[PDB]
Amino acid sequence: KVFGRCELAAAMKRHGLDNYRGYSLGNWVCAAKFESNFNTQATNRNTDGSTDYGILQINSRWWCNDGRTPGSRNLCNIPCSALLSSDITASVNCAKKIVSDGNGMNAWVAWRNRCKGTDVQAWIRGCRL
Catalogue the long-range contacts made by 30-34 (C-beta closer than 8 Å, 24 or more residues apart): 30/111, 30/114, 30/115, 30/118, 30/120, 30/123, 31/56, 31/105, 31/108, 31/110, 31/111, 31/115, 32/3, 32/8, 32/56, 33/5, 33/123, 34/110, 34/111, 34/114, 34/115
Q: Which of residues 97-126 bind Cl ion (CB under 5 A)?
A: 104
Q: In this chain, which of 24, 41, 43, 74 binds Na ion, going by CB under 5 A?
A: 74
By CB under 5 A, residue 79 contacts Cl ion = no
What amino acid positions are annotated as catalytic residues?
35, 52
Residue 74 interacting entry, from Na ion, Cl ion, none, C-beta within 5 to 8 Å by type: Na ion
Q: Is 48 annotated as a binding residue?
A: no
Q: Which residues of this protein are in contact with Cl ion, per CB under 5 A? A: 104
